[PDB]
Amino acid sequence: TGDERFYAEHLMPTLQGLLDPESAHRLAVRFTSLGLLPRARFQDSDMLEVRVLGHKFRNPVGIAAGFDKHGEAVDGLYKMGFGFVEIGSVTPKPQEGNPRPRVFRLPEDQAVINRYGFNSHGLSVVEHRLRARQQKQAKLTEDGLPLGVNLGKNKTSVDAAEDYAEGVRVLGPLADYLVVNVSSPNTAGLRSLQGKAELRRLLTKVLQERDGLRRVHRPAVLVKIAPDLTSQDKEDIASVVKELGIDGLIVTNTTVSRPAGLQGALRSETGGLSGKPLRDLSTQTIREMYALTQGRVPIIGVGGVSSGQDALEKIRAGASLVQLYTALTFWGPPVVGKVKRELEALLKEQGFGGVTDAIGADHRR
Amino acid sequence: TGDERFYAEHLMPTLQGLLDPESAHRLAVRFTSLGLLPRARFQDSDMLEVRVLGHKFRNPVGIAAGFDKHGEAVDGLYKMGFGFVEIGSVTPKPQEGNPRPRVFRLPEDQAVINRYGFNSHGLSVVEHRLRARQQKQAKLTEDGLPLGVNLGKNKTSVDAAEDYAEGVRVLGPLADYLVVNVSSPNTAGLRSLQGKAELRRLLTKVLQERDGLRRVHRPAVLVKIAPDLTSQDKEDIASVVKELGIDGLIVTNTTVSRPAGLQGALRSETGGLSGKPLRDLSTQTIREMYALTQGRVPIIGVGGVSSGQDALEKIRAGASLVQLYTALTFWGPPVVGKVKRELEALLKEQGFGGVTDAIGADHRR
Numbered sequence: 026t027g028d029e030r031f032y033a034e035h036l037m038p039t040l041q042g043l044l045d046p047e048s049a050h051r052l053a054v055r056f057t058s059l060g061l062l063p064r065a066r067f068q069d070s071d072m073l074e075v076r077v078l079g080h081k082f083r084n085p086v087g088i089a090a091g092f093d094k095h096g097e098a099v100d101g102l103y104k105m106g107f108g109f110v111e112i113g114s115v116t117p118k119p120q121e122g123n124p125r126p127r128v129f130r131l132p133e134d135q136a137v138i139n140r141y142g143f144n145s146h147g148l149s150v151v152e153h154r155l156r157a158r159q160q161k162q163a164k165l166t167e168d169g170l171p172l173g174v175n176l177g178k179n180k181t182s183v184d185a186a187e188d189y190a191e192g193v194r195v196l197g198p199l200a201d202y203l204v205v206n207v208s209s210p211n212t213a214g215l216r217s218l219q220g221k222a223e224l225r226r227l228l229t230k231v232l233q234e235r236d237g238l239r240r241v242h243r244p245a246v247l248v249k250i251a252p253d254l255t256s257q258d259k260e261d262i263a264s265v266v267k268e269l270g271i272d273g274l275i276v277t278n279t280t281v282s283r284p285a286g287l288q289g290a291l292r293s294e295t296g297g298l299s300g301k302p303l304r305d306l307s308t309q310t311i312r313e314m315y316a317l318t319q320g321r322v323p324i325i326g327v328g329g330v331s332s333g334q335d336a337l338e339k340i341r342a343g344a345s346l347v348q349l350y351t352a353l354t355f356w357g358p359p360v361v362g363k364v365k366r367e368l369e370a371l372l373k374e375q376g377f378g379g380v381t382d383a384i385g386a387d388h389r390r
Numbered sequence: 391t392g393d394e395r396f397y398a399e400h401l402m403p404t405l406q407g408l409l410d411p412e413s414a415h416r417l418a419v420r421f422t423s424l425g426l427l428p429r430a431r432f433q434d435s436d437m438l439e440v441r442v443l444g445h446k447f448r449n450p451v452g453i454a455a456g457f458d459k460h461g462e463a464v465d466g467l468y469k470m471g472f473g474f475v476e477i478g479s480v481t482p483k484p485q486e487g488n489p490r491p492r493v494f495r496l497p498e499d500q501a502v503i504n505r506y507g508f509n510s511h512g513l514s515v516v517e518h519r520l521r522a523r524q525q526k527q528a529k530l531t532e533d534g535l536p537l538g539v540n541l542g543k544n545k546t547s548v549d550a551a552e553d554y555a556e557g558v559r560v561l562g563p564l565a566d567y568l569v570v571n572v573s574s575p576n577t578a579g580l581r582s583l584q585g586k587a588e589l590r591r592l593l594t595k596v597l598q599e600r601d602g603l604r605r606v607h608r609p610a611v612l613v614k615i616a617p618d619l620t621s622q623d624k625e626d627i628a629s630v631v632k633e634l635g636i637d638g639l640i641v642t643n644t645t646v647s648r649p650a651g652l653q654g655a656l657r658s659e660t661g662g663l664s665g666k667p668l669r670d671l672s673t674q675t676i677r678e679m680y681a682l683t684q685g686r687v688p689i690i691g692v693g694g695v696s697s698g699q700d701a702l703e704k705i706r707a708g709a710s711l712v713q714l715y716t717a718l719t720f721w722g723p724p725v726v727g728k729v730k731r732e733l734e735a736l737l738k739e740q741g742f743g744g745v746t747d748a749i750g751a752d753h754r755r
């Protein structure tokens with residue numbers, strides 16, 4: 026398309042130059058929520074349909090958490106062409122997060138570093154926002170466009186598990202799936218929730234709250250993990266997920282690692298790294314978790330997806346769905362249609378009947 | 391093409407199943423040398439032409455060292471569609487290398503582990519082989535199809551620098567470029583040639599021998615490095631390469647690392663790992679070396695290239711040319727035309743006039 030080229034060559038270089046990343050983010054959210062951006066042209070083919078998590082997905086490409094933190098742009102994001110939308114992370118009480126600047130571009134690496142620190146309007150505000158369009162979402166979901174809600178915890182919380190339990194009770198009834206985010210690099214102590222007995226205790230509590238919701242309001246529960254886990258950590262997570270019957274995994278969050286070869290001036294900023302440098306570290310985590318779970322636990326693959334090949338690599342590694350975020354900050358909305366078009370071409374090329382046939386195909390070689 | 395699909399879906403799964411990798415290799419070399427494989431269909435466009443190392447390259451996609459170790463299949467490889475051919479590694483005296491098995495497939499990872507150990511017919515045999523077609527090569531080179539020779543050292547050599555000097559004197563006059571391979575993981579002590587004063591002493595000697603050849607027989611000298619270098623190692627190599635006026639770098643050899651997430655049963659075999667798991671580790675090394683050399687030293691990018699996107703990522707990171715090997719063992723000869731066709735499409739897509747415009751483009755973002 027000419028739009029892909031217009032955005033990538035002209036508009037995106039200009040806007041990102043004039044505005045700091047966080048300003049860009051806020052403007053992007055505003056434009057999306059007002060529906061100002063033109064409606065995506067790409068007609069979703071039947072090849073791209075996926076059935077997973079007790080839902081139909083019209084296409085396997087979603088927007089990752091962190092873009093629409095407060096649920097302000099859901100309808101605009103579906104219009105952008107995403108097959109599903111994940112909002113959040115949402116914390117129980119409102120909190121401002123870290124002081125600015127707290128987001129950084131690494132253009133030379135097609136990467137971003139962020140330390141937002143779970144800035145959130147809080148459960149009550151998001152609850153009311155989602156309630157305003159609850160029935161609209163019900164029809165979208167039935168038409169193959171589900172909604173995920175990513176739950177966080179407050180910085181000063183004295184009981185992580187009760188923060189997540191509050192989230193389940195408040196936003197669980199408005200979600201097709203919930204994400205327990207145990208993988209933010211920017212909240213002190215949080216990733217230690219990924220340890221065995223602690224994780225078991227936490228997810229037991231989350232799942233009990235979930236099971237206590239009425240049937241039509243009962244979401245799937247996923248756990249989102251970091252790319253920086255040890256082999257022991259991953260074995261433990263796999264073990265717990267299967268013991269408790271967690272519905273799926275999101276793989277992965279941003280990395281606190283700094284891979285060799287980063288060129289960006291801001292590469293030594295504190296925070297989670299996203300985008301291209303994360304891609305193959307995300308894909309290798311997907312591959313391991315798929316194998317550890319015997320292919321029986323749905324994975325949403327995320328980390329450095331900006332092409333059909335990126336997406337299909339994650340799918341073949343074991344992902345049933347993929348998300349992206351960082352690629353939008355470089356290529357803008359046209360990237361969504363680009364990834365789907367390329368993915369469809371590659372599936373035909375490699376002799377797959379659809380996305381579903383490609384899921385985990387690398388493990389059957 | 392239907393051939394790409396035929397090879398990838400039917401033929402390659404079958405052959406690699408019936409034969410052990412080394413048997414496959416030997417058969418592949420035999421078929422190639424006999425010209426039995428059909429002539430590549432892809433018409434090389436002007437966009438793909440590159441001028442570097444004092445030569446025109448009709449396309450930027452070459453065959454990496456290790457496939458045609460003894461210079462037996464050069465003409466078959468040009469027929470396959472490669473823009474340049476690198477033979478070797480060649481050691482001064484013949485040697486058998488390690489005991490079999492010494493090559494292993496990791497199908498689930500699209501990877502290979504090898505510990506051949508510089509099996510070589512030796513300089514004299516290769517010299518005579520190349521002399522038999524010297525004038526044929528002269529015309530190929532003038533038509534944009536250069537020939538590289540990769541030099542190794544004998545296992546029992548007591549003077550590494552004299553081994554490389556012998557190679558320069560014997561095969562240098564038959565080569566468009568020579569590669570000093572200081573990066574094999576399978577010869578004891580070899581990668582320690584990448585240290586500062588040792589490397590300086592070695593390359594000073596190589597370059598003196600090179601400069602002593604007659605002008606029409608005077609090749610470019612490149613150094614091939616491992617992906618497993620420390621930041622100190624890379625700084626030192628960059629420094630030496632610029633001090634001595636080394637003509638270019640090949641980046642990278644196979645890795646002795648085992649990235650997290652390898653699934654192959656044979657992942658704990660000793661040797662160098664190649665293919666997809668090496669891809670982003672190769673690309674990040676290219677990116678660093680390009681920056682350390684201020685973009686003034688040509689790089690041949692190699693490691694896990696099996697697509698146009700893989701190739702263009704290396705080019706944008708700083709590679710003037712790319713090589714592949716491992717992708718052939720999975721997709722067969724059609725992969726060559728595939729990479730070139732996809733590369734050409736991506737260049738147009740991203741608004742590059744040709745390969746030359748894309749070289750190092752990530753560093754100018």
Ligand SMILES: Cc1cc2nc3c(=O)[nH]c(=O)nc-3n(C[C@H](O)[C@H](O)[C@H](O)COP(=O)(O)O)c2cc1C
Nearest residue numbers: 089090091113114139278299300328329349350351
């Ligand atoms: C600015 C920013 C904010 C993010 N905020 C969240 C968040 O609140 N919750 C979460 O689970 N992940 C968050 N993420 C992580 C993304 O959801 C995603 O896992 C990661 O960025 C990798 O995908 P990408 O490389 O396509 O960006 C954030 C990422 C970025 C760049």
Ligand SMILES: Cc1cc2nc3c(=O)[nH]c(=O)nc-3n(C[C@H](O)[C@H](O)[C@H](O)COP(=O)(O)O)c2cc1C
Nearest residue numbers: 454455456478479504643664665693694714715716
């Ligand atoms: C079986 C095998 C043998 C190789 N032999 C050599 C060699 O003799 N000299 C050399 O410089 N590199 C050698 N290599 C490394 C390749 O030239 C290349 O650097 C590496 O395989 C990464 O490219 P690839 O991932 O496309 O295979 C060999 C690789 C393989 C797989």
Ligand SMILES: Nc1nc(-c2nn(Cc3ccccc3F)c3ncccc23)ncc1C1CC1
Nearest residue numbers: 040046047049050052053056128353354357358
């Ligand atoms: N720096 C960022 N940029 C973007 C971002 N920009 N644009 C282009 C753009 C289009 C229209 C109006 C204004 C625009 F900025 C986006 N379009 C679609 C989705 C998201 C974006 N999102 C997040 C961040 C930072 C937290 C990391």
Ligand SMILES: Nc1nc(-c2nn(Cc3ccccc3F)c3ncccc23)ncc1C1CC1
Nearest residue numbers: 405411412414415417418421493718719722723
């Ligand atoms: N296992 C390997 N396989 C191959 C390999 N196979 N084929 C297919 C094939 C085609 C025709 C006749 C026989 C064939 F095997 C190749 N075609 C073109 C180039 C190279 C190949 N090369 C190397 C290795 C091992 C050292 C790593």
Ligand SMILES: O=c1cc(C(O)O)[nH]c(=O)[nH]1
Nearest residue numbers: 141142143209211279297
């Ligand atoms: O999960 C998360 C949360 C944040 C944040 O800073 O709010 N950042 C990330 O990269 N991942």
Ligand SMILES: O=c1cc(C(O)O)[nH]c(=O)[nH]1
Nearest residue numbers: 506507508574576644662
């Ligand atoms: O440079 C080299 C040499 C060999 C070999 O085992 O002969 N293997 C590699 O992977 N790289």
Ligand SMILES: [Cl-]
Nearest residue numbers: 237238239240
């Ligand atoms: Cl009830």
Ligand SMILES: [Cl-]
Nearest residue numbers: 290291292293
């Ligand atoms: Cl630094």
Ligand SMILES: [Cl-]
Nearest residue numbers: 602603604605
């Ligand atoms: Cl003379």
Ligand SMILES: [Cl-]
Nearest residue numbers: 655656657658
């Ligand atoms: Cl093992």
